């Protein structure tokens, strides 16, 4: 190198190229993987991450952990990106994708160090991934009966398997039943915004309940609210998008009068406008009034005089869920409050839950929405419960779309590894080494399960390999019995798309990482 008085790129540009930078990229991917390594399996462990502000986020979800980690390595961000992709498309397996991608990179690192051309490795990964996806689609178990009881049991088992890695795994049967019921009460699109998640401090996990209806917190009651009855036995709900309070008619409105009679007439006109709105609402026969916009104290007292219930400033999504559960329509005007646009629920009640007041709309027979009310001893407790339930809900939705399942516990991956090794043993040999490396890399998840559980991974892996070779498809890791077992017969079920997407994303990330050979970092501008 020479000074070159006029340098080519901007001063401070950093460049790395060749085999060393690719090995460094592989090492960085390994470092990213080992951050979520111990979170996998029923013996997984949560991780605590504190941001700059001092707030702590306790989580077992791989995608959340990777997002909270401030990764700046250009090659390492690919693992976080594929974890986010797996979370978005599927919702489960956010740790398996990272483990698989990093294990692929580690397995092909020795061949990279020997000067092998990366295009060959990329081609080998593409071939192996295509074969593995086809094998998964072929051997996945599906039932051509569409039995409702069988479908419910399948969904419950899938939810239990999804939930048996988090802190709510003790009540996994309870939460799986709740999640399956909530998802089956969704109508046709399985919108996530139609499932409410309410987190209330205090109480045990078993105290958490699912409301076949809608529920939301009490919202800034005005004076006179305590005089309204708090229970109805067949109320008609008037969902409104209306500001029910004395106020100026319009922002640009201006009143010009030159007589005290007109002054009194104007005052009475304002009062009569408000009273006309209130009387139009009351005459509709409704007993519960909900408004997205605030409801004033005058309206609150007016409704209290009529033994009616009112609640303004209701959150918009809560109003939408109430509309879906009760079957009314949100009205921006009160001029036509017909029976068509009035909601109906069997029972409305305001009860106290852990030092807070919640409004309950139960007894809805045609509800297409739900509301989870979660209890726990700490804010992170409710947050992690919500994350686990979100994973379960995504799994159940995907299973609703297609009830094709594969056994868990690493059985599917051991079968895939055996199949890929058998295939690789019948090709010239430059691709054979790489496909065999891919098949061996597929063994990472059962080994990680055994390592987290405190087993001896080598003996269990040998037993699994022998069992798969000699005949047997769904033999995985039995955590409780310190041994291996038929995981299909043990109801450790998993939707096929989870493993399909995991393999696809891991292969794409590995190919992208291997392809790059030069890293250039232009200097930061305006560090400040």
């Amino acid at each position: 190198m020479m000074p070159t008085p006029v340098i080519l790129l901007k001063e401070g540009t950093d460049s790395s190229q060749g085999i060393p930078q690719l090995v460094s990229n592989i090492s960085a991917c390994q470092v990213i993987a080992e951050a979520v390594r111990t979170t996998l399996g029923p013996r997984g462990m949560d991780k605590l991450i504190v941001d700059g502000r001092g707030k702590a986020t306790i989580s077992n979800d791989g995608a959340t952990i990777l997002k909270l980690l401030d990764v700046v390595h250009p090659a390492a961000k690919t693992l976080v990106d594929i974890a986010k992709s797996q979370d978005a498309e599927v919702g489960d397996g956010t740790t398996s994708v990272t483990l698989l991608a990093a294990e692929f990179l580690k397995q092909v690192k020795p061949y990279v160090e020997e000067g092998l051309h990366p295009q060959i490795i990329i081609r080998a990964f593409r071939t192996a991934t295509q074969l593995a996806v086809n094998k998964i689609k072929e051997i996945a178990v599906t039932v051509k009966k569409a039995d409702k009881v069988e479908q419910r049991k399948l969904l419950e088992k899938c939810a239990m398997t999804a939930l048996s890695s988090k802190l709510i795994s003790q009540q996994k049967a309870f939460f799986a039943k709740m999640v399956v019921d909530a998802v089956m009460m969704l109508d046709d699109l399985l919108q996530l915004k139609m499932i409410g998640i309410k987190k209330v401090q205090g109480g045990a996990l078993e105290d958490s309940q699912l409301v076949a209806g809608v529920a939301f917190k009490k919202t800034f009651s005005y004076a006179g609210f305590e005089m309204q009855p708090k229970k109805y036995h067949n109320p008609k709900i008037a969902l409104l998008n209306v500001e029910l309070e004395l106020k100026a008619e319009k922002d640009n409105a201006e009143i010009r009068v030159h007589t005290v009679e007109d002054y009194q007439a104007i005052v009475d006109a304002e009062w009569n406008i408000l009273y006309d709105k209130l009387e139009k609402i009351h005459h509709s026969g409704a007993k519960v009034v909900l408004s997205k916009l605030p409801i004033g104290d005058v309206a609150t007292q007016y409704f209290a005089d009529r033994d009616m219930f009112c609640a303004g400033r209701v959150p918009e999504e809560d109003l939408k869920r109430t509309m879906m559960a009760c079957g009314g329509s949100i009205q921006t005007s009160v001029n036509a409050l017909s029976a068509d646009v009035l909601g109906r629920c069997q029972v409305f009640e305001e009860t106290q839950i852990g030092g807070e007041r919640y409004n309950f709309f139960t007894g809805c027979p045609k509800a297409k929405t739900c509301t989870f009310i979660l209890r726990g001893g700490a804010e992170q407790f409710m947050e992690e419960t919500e994350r686990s339930l979100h994973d379960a809900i995504m799994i159940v939705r995907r299973a609703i779309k297609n009830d094709s399942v594969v056994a868990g516990g690493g059985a599917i991956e051991m079968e895939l590894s055996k199949y890929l090794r058998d295939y690789s043993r019948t090709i010239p040999g430059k691709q054979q080494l790489l496909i065999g490396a891919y098949a061996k890399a597929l063994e990472i998840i059962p080994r990680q399960l055994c390592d987290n559980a405190g087993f001896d991974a080598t003996n269990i892996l040998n037993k699994l390999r022998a069992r798969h070779a000699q005949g047997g498809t769904w033999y995985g890791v039995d955590i409780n019995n310190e041994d291996i077992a038929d995981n299909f017969e043990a109801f450790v079920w998993e939707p096929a798309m989870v493993r399909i997407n995991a393999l696809t994303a891991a292969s794409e990330a590995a190919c992208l990482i291997v392809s790059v050979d030069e890293t250039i970092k232009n200097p930061r501008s305006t560090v400040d």
Binding site: S24, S27, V31, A56, L69, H73, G355, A378, E379, G454
Partner: protein
């Protein structure tokens, strides 16, 4: 045992993965459990002297010099200025017990501290903490059933 990891690569090239990785700390494995158990034990031992009719008050002073003589465990832990995350978990546990019930905000902390203290010696003998948690859950179910059994009704 701290400061995360530092490699600088085997080729001598810079190895930066996490932003400000030099100024971040990391506890891994059993050491983290031991530290958390010790902090929770300290909090529980501080609370345990304010239990019962012969309990003694805690004189709590905020950042403005306001003085609050109190025995309520939830109030003491809410006004306490802590930095350890496990201490914040203890404070939130007291707050949750107060919100759900309103009484017993001190017994929960002492019970949790005792549970973690026993878990310490259980871990020292080579038991996976998930096994300890499962055993604690089973024992808690048994104790709750027994409490339901020996409960008595009042008018």
């Amino acid at each position: 045992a701290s400061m995360g990891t530092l490699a600088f690569d085997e080729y001598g090239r810079p190895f930066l993965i996490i932003k400000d990785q030099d100024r971040k700390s990391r506890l891994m494995g059993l050491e983290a459990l031991k530290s958390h158990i010790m902090a929770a034990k300290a909090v529980a031992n501080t609370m345990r002297t304010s239990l019962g009719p012969n309990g003694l008050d805690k004189m709590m002073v905020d950042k403005d010099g306001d003085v609050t003589v109190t025995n309520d465990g939830a109030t003491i832990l809410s006004m306490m200025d802590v930095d350890h995350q496990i201490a914040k978990l203890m404070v939130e546990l007291s707050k949750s017990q107060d919100d759900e019930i309103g009484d017993g905000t001190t017994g929960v902390v002492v019970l949790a501290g005792a549970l973690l203290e026993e878990a310490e010696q259980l871990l020292d003998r080579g038991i996976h903490p998930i096994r300890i948690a499962d055993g604690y859950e089973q024992a808690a179910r048994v104790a709750i059933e027994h409490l339901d059994k020996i409960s008595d009704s009042v008018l």
